[PDB]
Amino acid sequence: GAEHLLEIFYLLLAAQVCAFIFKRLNQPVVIGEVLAGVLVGPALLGLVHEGEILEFLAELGAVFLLFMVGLETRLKDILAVGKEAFLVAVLGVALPFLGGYLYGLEIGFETLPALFLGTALVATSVGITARVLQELGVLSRPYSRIILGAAVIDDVLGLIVLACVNGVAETGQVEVGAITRLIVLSVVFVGLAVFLSTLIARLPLERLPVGSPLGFALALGVGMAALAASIGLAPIVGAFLGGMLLSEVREKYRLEEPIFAIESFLAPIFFAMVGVRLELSALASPVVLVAGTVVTVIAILGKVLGGFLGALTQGVRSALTVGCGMAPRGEVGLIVAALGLKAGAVNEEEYAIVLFMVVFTTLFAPFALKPLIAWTERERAAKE
Amino acid sequence: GAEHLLEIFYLLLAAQVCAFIFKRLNQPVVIGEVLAGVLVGPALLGLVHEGEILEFLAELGAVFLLFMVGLETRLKDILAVGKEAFLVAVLGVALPFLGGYLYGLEIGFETLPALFLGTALVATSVGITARVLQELGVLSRPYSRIILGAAVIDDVLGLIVLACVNGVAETGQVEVGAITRLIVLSVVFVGLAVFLSTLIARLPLERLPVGSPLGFALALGVGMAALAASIGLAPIVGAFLGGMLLSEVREKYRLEEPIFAIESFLAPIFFAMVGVRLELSALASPVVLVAGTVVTVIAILGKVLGGFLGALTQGVRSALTVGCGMAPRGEVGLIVAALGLKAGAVNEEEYAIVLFMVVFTTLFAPFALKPLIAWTERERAAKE
Numbered sequence: 146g147a148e149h150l151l152e153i154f155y156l157l158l159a160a161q162v163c164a165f166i167f168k169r170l171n172q173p174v175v176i177g178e179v180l181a182g183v184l185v186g187p188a189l190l191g192l193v194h195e196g197e198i199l200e201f202l203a204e205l206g207a208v209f210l211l212f213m214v215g216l217e218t219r220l221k222d223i224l225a226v227g228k229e230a231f232l233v234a235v236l237g238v239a240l241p242f243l244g245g246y247l248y249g250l251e252i253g254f255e256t257l258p259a260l261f262l263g264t265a266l267v268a269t270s271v272g273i274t275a276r277v278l279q280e281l282g283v284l285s286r287p288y289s290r291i292i293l294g295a296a297v298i299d300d301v302l303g304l305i306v307l308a309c310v311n312g313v314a315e316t317g318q319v320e321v322g323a324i325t326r327l328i329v330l331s332v333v334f335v336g337l338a339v340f341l342s343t344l345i346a347r348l349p350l351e352r353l354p355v356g357s358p359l360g361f362a363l364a365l366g367v368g369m370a371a372l373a374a375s376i377g378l379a380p381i382v383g384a385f386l387g388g389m390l391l392s393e394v395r396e397k398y399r400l401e402e403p404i405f406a407i408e409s410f411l412a413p414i415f416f417a418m419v420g421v422r423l424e425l426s427a428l429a430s431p432v433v434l435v436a437g438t439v440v441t442v443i444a445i446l447g448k449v450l451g452g453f454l455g456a457l458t459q460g461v462r463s464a465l466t467v468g469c470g471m472a473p474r475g476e477v478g479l480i481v482a483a484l485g486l487k488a489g490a491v492n493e494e495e496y497a498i499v500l501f502m503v504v505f506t507t508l509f510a511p512f513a514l515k516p517l518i519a520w521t522e523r524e525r526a527a528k529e
Numbered sequence: 530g531a532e533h534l535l536e537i538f539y540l541l542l543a544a545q546v547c548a549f550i551f552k553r554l555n556q557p558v559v560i561g562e563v564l565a566g567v568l569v570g571p572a573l574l575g576l577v578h579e580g581e582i583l584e585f586l587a588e589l590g591a592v593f594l595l596f597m598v599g600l601e602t603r604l605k606d607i608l609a610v611g612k613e614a615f616l617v618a619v620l621g622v623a624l625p626f627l628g629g630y631l632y633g634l635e636i637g638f639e640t641l642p643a644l645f646l647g648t649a650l651v652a653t654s655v656g657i658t659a660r661v662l663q664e665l666g667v668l669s670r671p672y673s674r675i676i677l678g679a680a681v682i683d684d685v686l687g688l689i690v691l692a693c694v695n696g697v698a699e700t701g702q703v704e705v706g707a708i709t710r711l712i713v714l715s716v717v718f719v720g721l722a723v724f725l726s727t728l729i730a731r732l733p734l735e736r737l738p739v740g741s742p743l744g745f746a747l748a749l750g751v752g753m754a755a756l757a758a759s760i761g762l763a764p765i766v767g768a769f770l771g772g773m774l775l776s777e778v779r780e781k782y783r784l785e786e787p788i789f790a791i792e793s794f795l796a797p798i799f800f801a802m803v804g805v806r807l808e809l810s811a812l813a814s815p816v817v818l819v820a821g822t823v824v825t826v827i828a829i830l831g832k833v834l835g836g837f838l839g840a841l842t843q844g845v846r847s848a849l850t851v852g853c854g855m856a857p858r859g860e861v862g863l864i865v866a867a868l869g870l871k872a873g874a875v876n877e878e879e880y881a882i883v884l885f886m887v888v889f890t891t892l893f894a895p896f897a898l899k900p901l902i903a904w905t906e907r908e909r910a911a912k913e
């Protein structure tokens with residue numbers, strides 16, 4: 146009870162300070178937050194441990210980050226680049242998967258673990274990316290919108306991939322009905338969201354028996370997350386979509402600011418808690434470091450190239466920035482790794498090898514992403 | 530995982546609607562929120578159940594409510610009526626306790642349960658009261674400040690009373706050292722808070738390695754709660770105090786608004802969750818309803834009179850409004866009731882009898898409190 150108030154305190158103070166240290170280095174804040182979680186977490190101070198409660202708070206954090214982003218992101222905006230979104234997504238799943246599975250077959254990983262390698266390489270944590278794009282006030286740009294939309298598609302794709310894989314881990318075949326069911330639930334949910342959001346501005350909440358337009362927004366957001374999560378998608382997606390629903394009425398209701406407040410309350414906990422859940426396996430470990438480094442380069446190159454190719458339309462400058470913005474694996478890669486360990490599909494060694502790369506990718510990606518944003522905005526002025 | 534997103538959704542929608550129903554009846558919103566928790570909770574819909582997570586979120590809600598109130602409440606303000614605060618507090622514990630214990634001896638309650646009756650009658654849930662005082666934009670008035678300060682004292686008093694009682698439940702004597710230790714920890718913590726807050730404006734956070742004045746505030750608030758809770762006080766108090774620390778720098782940092790946002794996110798969950806945790810014992814029950822009604826009148830009259838007498842200085846009009854604002858027992862009475870059941874100190878019958886009165890007091894009090902506020906402000910204009 147005071148356990149959790151204490152822990153939350155630690156997370157907040159560490160995250161505030163680490164954010165200060167990283168702000169003063171012209172480096173993005175997200176890294177500070179994650180490192181704060183590593184700082185106070187098991188790895189170093191052991192002040193903060195993994196709690197069902199701390200994990201859920203972290204979840205809400207990710208949610209509000211994405212609700213915030215969708216609030217400033219309209220359908221017209223993402224659709225108008227939706228083809229590059231789609232392409233970036235599909236290539237982003239295809240390329241590091243094959244690379245993953247192939248590289249698994251070569252070290253000596255068996256068919257099922259190798260499949261899990263490709264699986265982990267498929268994942269994408271737009272939470273982190275979003276945090277950066279938000280910081281540099283860039284959420285409006287084309288590459289950021291392609292990143293968002295493509296991320297949304299990338300989620301349904303990744304879910305199908307994991308459904309297939311857990312399927313072959315449990316019985317050995319892929320339950321086709323389950324797959325198609327997920328595809329239908331996903332497509333219907335997303336399309337229903339989109340439809341709903343071409344109708345939001347036309348109907349101000351006024352006749353709704355709600356007590357405040359904000360309270361309405363919070364429900365039509367947390368609820369969107371919940372819905373997404375019940376279908377089998379990441380809550381972050383329900384969140385983003387819920388944001389889009391209300392983005393054509395955002396300014397009209399003074400929503401941008403109080404949502405931004407909540408986000409900048411819970412998001413640090415989310416990123417910190419990502420840092421909390423990173424393990425000391427890459428410490429004094431060999432095959433882990435070697436195979437890990439290789440699978441890491443395969444991961445980054447897979448994502449970055451998929452992105453570069455899908456949105457090559459906007460010219461190289463944007464294309465890497467999308468690709469690079471698809472790199473980090475964060476809480477997602479962590480999750481796939483955990484499920485991999487549980488169902489007896491991955492040794493603690495192969496788990497160390499995957500964890501190494503979700504850690505390195507999570508760290509590396511937002512570094513490279515910052516100058517890439519500058520090197521794209523400087524070039525956008527010479528054609529402005 | 531989607532369990533908790535779902536539940537939270539239900540709580541939010543019900544609370545928004547119930548708030549709408551109660552707003553349209555010129556009745557305070559808190560009642561709507563609690564009833565929403567009763568609506569969706571075990572008692573009716575069983576959509577939302579008690580979760581360790583939902584309980585903790587509820588806690589944070591109460592915290593932010595009180596951080597919010599302390600942010601708009603300075604030391605000078607409470608001190609300048611601190612004697613009525615003190616008096617109101619001590620009488621507020623003394624009078625319903627004796628009434629409680631005496632009335633226990635008369636029904637047939639044994640010494641230990643009767644002591645628990647007086648105990649429950651001692652409790653006070655300023656959370657609810659604060660929610661009302663906030664709604665009617667009255668947090669600045671004298672009676673509201675006496676209510677707050679007196680509530681703070683009332684907390685240390687109640688803690689000492691419960692320490693004594695759990696003491697006689699466990700061994701049969703009162704561990705004197707434990708008591709005095711609590712008194713010292715409490716006095717030192719509160720005084721240290723006060724001292725700290727005469728020094729806050731003089732030192733803007735600027736030289737602190739914090740990433741934002743708001744993030745600082747959130748830490749110096751959740752942390753204050755945590756501290757309070759480790760000493761053995763309600764987190765609500767750490768919260769309020771933390772608010773006061775930053776109230777002499779509130780406007781300077783644009784804190785009032787984002788804190789108000791978070792409060793009006795989590796507070797409904799808190800009040801709803803109070804409603805969730807109310808049991809169907811007073812349903813088709815006799816001795817429960819009788820003895821419950823009596824102990825309820827004793828509860829209300831005890832609190833209201835204590836308040837009336839402590840702050841009689843400000844004239845009858847304010848005096849009842851303080852007294853009445855001390856009436857509700859909410860999450861506190863609920864807590865004392867639970868601990869009473871656990872340590873084998875109270876039968877399910879006597880528990881029904883206490884629960885009946887925490888429920889009726891919690892409901893009744895904010896009703897009477899609204900016209901009492903009007904009937905005090907109308908009279909304050911004829912001497913304005």
Ligand SMILES: [Zn+2]
Pocket residue numbers: 146149196198581
């Ligand atoms: Zn716990």
Ligand SMILES: [Zn+2]
Pocket residue numbers: 148152192193194
């Ligand atoms: Zn812990």
Ligand SMILES: [Zn+2]
Pocket residue numbers: 197530533580582
């Ligand atoms: Zn749970």
Ligand SMILES: [Zn+2]
Pocket residue numbers: 532536576577578
């Ligand atoms: Zn439940």
